[PDB]
Amino acid sequence: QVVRIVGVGRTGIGKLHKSVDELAASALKCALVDANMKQCDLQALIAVPSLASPQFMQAHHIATVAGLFPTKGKFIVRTVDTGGAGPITALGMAVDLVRTRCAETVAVIAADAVLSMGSGAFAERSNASLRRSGLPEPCIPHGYDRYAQWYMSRYGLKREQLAMVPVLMSKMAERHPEAMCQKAYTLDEVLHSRCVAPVTNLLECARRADGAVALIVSGEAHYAEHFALGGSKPIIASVAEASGPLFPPGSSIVPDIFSCRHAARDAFLSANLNVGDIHFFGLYDCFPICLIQAVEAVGLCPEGKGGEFMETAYNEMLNNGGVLDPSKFPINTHGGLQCFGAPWEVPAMYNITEAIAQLSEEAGDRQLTPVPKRALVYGNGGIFSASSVAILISD
Amino acid sequence: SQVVRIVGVGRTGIGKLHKSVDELAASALKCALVDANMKQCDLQALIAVPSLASPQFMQAHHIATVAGLFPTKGKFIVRTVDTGGAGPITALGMAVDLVRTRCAETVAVIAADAVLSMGSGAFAERSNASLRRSGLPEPCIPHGYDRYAQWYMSRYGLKREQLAMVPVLMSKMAERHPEAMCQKAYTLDEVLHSRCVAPVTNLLECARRADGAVALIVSGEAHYAEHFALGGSKPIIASVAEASGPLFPPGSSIVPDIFSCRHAARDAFLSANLNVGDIHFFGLYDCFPICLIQAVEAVGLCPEGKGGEFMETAYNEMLNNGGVLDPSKFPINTHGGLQCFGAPWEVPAMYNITEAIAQLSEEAGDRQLTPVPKRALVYGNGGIFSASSVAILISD
Ligand SMILES: CC(=O)CC(=O)SCCNC(=O)CCNC(=O)[C@H](O)C(C)(C)COP(=O)(O)OP(=O)(O)OC[C@H]1O[C@@H](n2cnc3c(N)ncnc32)[C@H](O)[C@@H]1OP(=O)(O)O
Numbered sequence: 001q002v003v004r005i006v007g008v009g010r011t012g013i014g015k016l017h018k019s020v021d022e023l024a025a026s027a028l029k030c031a032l033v034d035a036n037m038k039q040c041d042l043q044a045l046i047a048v049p050s051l052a053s054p055q056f057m058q059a060h061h062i063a064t065v066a067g068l069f070p071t072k073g074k075f076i077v078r079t080v081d082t083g084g085a086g087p088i089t090a091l092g093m094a095v096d097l098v099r100t101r102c103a104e105t106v107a108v109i110a111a112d113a114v115l116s117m118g119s120g121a122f123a124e125r126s127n128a129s130l131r132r133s134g135l136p137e138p139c140i141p142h143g144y145d146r147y148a149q150w151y152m153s154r155y156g157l158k159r160e161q162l163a164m165v166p167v168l169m170s171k172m173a174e175r176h177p178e179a180m181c182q183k184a185y186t187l188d189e190v191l192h193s194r195c196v197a198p199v200t201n202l203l204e205c206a207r208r209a210d211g212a213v214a215l216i217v218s219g220e221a222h223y224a225e226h227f228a229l230g231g232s233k234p235i236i237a238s239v240a241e242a243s244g245p246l247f248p249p250g251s252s253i254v255p256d257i258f259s260c261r262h263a264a265r266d267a268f269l270s271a272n273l274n275v276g277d278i279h280f281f282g283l284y285d286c287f288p289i290c291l292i293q294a295v296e297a298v299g300l301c302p303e304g305k306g307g308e309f310m311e312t313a314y315n316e317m318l319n320n321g322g323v324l325d326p327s328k329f330p331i332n333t334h335g336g337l338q339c340f341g342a343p344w345e346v347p348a349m350y351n352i353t354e355a356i357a358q359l360s361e362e363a364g365d366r367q368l369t370p371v372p373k374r375a376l377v378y379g380n381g382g383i384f385s386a387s388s389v390a391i392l393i394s395d
Numbered sequence: 396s397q398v399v400r401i402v403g404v405g406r407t408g409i410g411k412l413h414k415s416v417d418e419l420a421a422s423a424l425k426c427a428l429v430d431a432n433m434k435q436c437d438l439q440a441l442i443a444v445p446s447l448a449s450p451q452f453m454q455a456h457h458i459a460t461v462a463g464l465f466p467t468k469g470k471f472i473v474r475t476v477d478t479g480g481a482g483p484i485t486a487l488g489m490a491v492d493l494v495r496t497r498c499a500e501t502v503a504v505i506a507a508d509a510v511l512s513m514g515s516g517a518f519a520e521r522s523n524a525s526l527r528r529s530g531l532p533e534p535c536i537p538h539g540y541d542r543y544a545q546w547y548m549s550r551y552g553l554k555r556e557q558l559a560m561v562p563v564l565m566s567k568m569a570e571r572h573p574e575a576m577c578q579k580a581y582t583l584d585e586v587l588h589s590r591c592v593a594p595v596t597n598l599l600e601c602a603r604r605a606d607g608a609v610a611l612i613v614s615g616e617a618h619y620a621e622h623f624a625l626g627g628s629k630p631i632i633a634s635v636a637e638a639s640g641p642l643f644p645p646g647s648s649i650v651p652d653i654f655s656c657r658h659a660a661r662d663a664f665l666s667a668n669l670n671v672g673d674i675h676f677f678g679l680y681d682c683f684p685i686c687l688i689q690a691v692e693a694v695g696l697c698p699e700g701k702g703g704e705f706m707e708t709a710y711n712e713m714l715n716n717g718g719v720l721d722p723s724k725f726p727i728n729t730h731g732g733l734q735c736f737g738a739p740w741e742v743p744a745m746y747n748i749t750e751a752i753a754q755l756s757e758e759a760g761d762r763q764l765t766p767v768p769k770r771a772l773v774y775g776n777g778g779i780f781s782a783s784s785v786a787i788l789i790s791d
């Protein structure tokens with residue numbers, strides 16, 4: 001059965017001074033208007049946890065405070081935690097609910113407020129997320145830093161190639177007014193920015209933000225009959241997942257730890273497509289090593305060569321009068337976690353929303369020509385611990 | 396499309412174990428693998444539920460990492476799901492889905508907690524914080540269920556003593572299970588005389604805090620037969636269904652459509668192509684008496700609003716049978732349930748499953764139903780009637 005994303009809604013991004021409940025409720029209202037639906041048309045809701053306001057049975061808490069109950073007929077609610085892979089994991093769960101006929105329509109919601117919560121509270125709760133890892137604080141950046149160092153030793157990845165990631169992302173961010181990064185970085189600025197971990201500087205770190213996104217998923221026929229273009233409500237062609245350890249081993253690490261390749265392969269197989277058929281990529285980029293690993297995993301370049309992929313794109317940007325042409329780097333045209341923003345487990349949602357914009361020819365000055373017919377989105381959780389990949393097609 | 400079975404069960408003891416949640420989870424999983432005649436490397440997925448005693452970001456991943464499941468040779472899918480006490484059965488349905496879509500041929504489902512060892516102060520704090528914005532007085536969860544019980548008394552004429560009969564019946568079952576935390580059956584007077592917790596809920600009517608963990612291994616029948624290989628000891632998961640309701644009750648009393656167990660039960664029966672008369676064992680979530688009263692109505696063991704009378708007739712028959720509760724006349728929670736077996740937060744719907752397996756395989760001992768049940772229904776509930784999960788297990 002053909003399943004589509006039929007509604008998208010979201011809040012702004014940044015320091016919003018709103019509760020997580022308020023942000024979630026706003027995003028969902030927006031998504032329902034976008035889908036030409038009302039609350040009573042929803043048959044399920046899936047959410048992911050919040051760091052700023054952790055709640056027991058988060059999805060149920062959101063649904064209750066947002067006034068979805070009482071309901072006429074069946075309503076299935078669930079919370080899932082696969083870290084930043086969560087929004088795409090949930091998307092796959094939504095497809096499953098529709099295909100098994102447990103729910104004809106499904107809301108998927110992610111919301112957080114990790115900028116408004118304050119630096120002290122964020123540091124405490126984000127570091128506590130990695131107890132027993134043995135990682136120095138801040139733990140998540142140090143975890144990714146250890147994998148980056150392994151890459152440099154194993155594959156010859158260069159320090160400057162890591163720093164090129166936020167440069168490229170910032171060039172994309174410039175063409176998105178909502179992106180938190182306003183002015184593109186130079187390579188020198190990134191390398192001169194405050195050190196956070198041995199090979200990770202401040203400008204290479206995911207940008208704390210508040211924000212929420214809601215998606216509505218429905219069977220194609222069901223939607224056509226009741227609620228009444230292809231690219232603006234894309235088909236979810238496939239979703240696949242894979243996993244790895246929550247944190248790295250004390251002693252350096254093996255290639256089979258990385259799970260994105262497995263997820264990507266299975267998503268391509270399920271969709272009956274190859275990398276050459278995909279013309280937009282929304283790839284999780286919490287740190288440069290994540291994006292470098294991602295481009296390899298999805299088949300944009302050979303294993304161990306992701307750093308060189310960045311350098312060629314950087315060099316071409318420099319030779320093109322400092323302009324990063326989207327057609328030569330069809331990745332994260334919104335700016336990613338680096339430069340658009342990162343509300344904890346939310347931002348894989350922005351890969352989906354940017355893919356939809358590209359597919360529907362509504363991406364503006366970021367728009368790819370010709371219009372992409374197919375897109376791939378990738379969510380990552382933990383420290384390369386969860387991989388979720390989906391392929392979206394217009395028709 | 397494809398037949399999926401529970402091929403391995405493992406669990407720890409129950410009570411005050413003074414072990415970490417990680418340690419309990421790892422032990423349960425090792426036990427389940429031995430029970431399935433499998434090794435770690437034969438697992439292709441792991442689903443877990445959160446712990447109150449040791450909350451962890453990406454709980455399932457944390458457990459899998461500390462337990463040494465990585466590095467792995469092939470694909471391995473890990474996820475944590477939260478539907479409260481409905482979680483173990485929710486996860487069971489997700490495991491079936493992973494097998495049928497061919498994402499994973501084998502799936503471990505794990506629940507672990509240590510809410511007795513964590514201490515009363517910490518438990519009260521974290522359990523009450525679980526219901527922020529509810530407006531419920533402390534302890535919040537008991538008061539939430541208490542409000543629904545009071546509504547039942549006003550709406551359907553449920554009597555106070557009929558609530559108190561639930562733990563009496565459960566304690567009679569618990570007596571015949573050596574692992575159950577309750578070892579001496581209660582009298583009705585003892586329950587009614589016990590310390591008040593909420594307006595119509597006393598201490599002996601409350602879910603019994605405990606530590607414990609359970610692990611299940613789920614696999615396609617053919618896959619399992621080829622590589623690792625009775626029907627009742629490794630039962631078919633015939634169907635799983637879910638439904639939901641608000642996390643906490645409205646300020647002003649409440650409507651019948653709030654309750655979701657009936658919907659979940661109906662859909663599970665439809666998926667399995669069975670009726671209530673085909674089921675001869677019921678493992679029904681019973682965190683408080685009102686939960687069990689609602690459950691027996693929802694699954695079709697008695698009419699709506701009459702669950703209290705169902706308890707009273709069983710109680711009266713027990714009294715007229717020399718104080719002996721005959722399992723064949725009350726084929727429900729033969730282990731003692733959350734009331735009298737024990738309740739490690741989101742774990743105890745696992746014990747409905749393990750008791751169903753024991754009954755189906757004729758390994759339930761002095762609790763054993765005769766004739767041997769061929770089919771069982773298990774029910775998990777989360778929040779305050781907020782999540783319903785129902786599964787039907789059959790031997791063949
Ligand atoms: C969840 C999953 O499963 C997977 C994942 O997403 S992994 C990624 C999760 N997210 C993170 O790890 C967050 C990374 N960031 C951090 O840990 C911290 O922000 C940090 C260690 C980098 C800095 O912490 P800090 O010392 O408290 O500085 P912080 O208060 O954050 O920011 C200070 C300033 O730098 C700026 N800044 C911070 N990060 C920036 C970035 N990436 N780019 C540009 N500017 C930045 C801010 O604008 C801020 O300005 P003001 O002082 O004027 O407000």
Ligand SMILES: CC(=O)CC(=O)SCCNC(=O)CCNC(=O)[C@H](O)C(C)(C)COP(=O)(O)OP(=O)(O)OC[C@H]1O[C@@H](n2cnc3c(N)ncnc32)[C@H](O)[C@@H]1OP(=O)(O)O
Pocket residue numbers: 478479480481515522534536537592598599600601602603604682734738740741776777778779
């Ligand atoms: C999570 C979901 O999604 C759905 C659900 O499961 S909802 C149910 C979740 N679980 C609960 O709500 C737990 C219910 N229990 C409680 O809230 C509390 O234990 C309580 C309010 C009943 C009592 O708290 P308290 O005043 O601190 O007493 P507590 O420390 O628990 O124990 C009191 C004593 O009586 C005994 N006792 C406690 N509960 C008992 C019970 N249900 N039956 C028999 N004996 C009990 C204990 O052995 C203890 O003995 P000592 O103090 O002499 O060692």
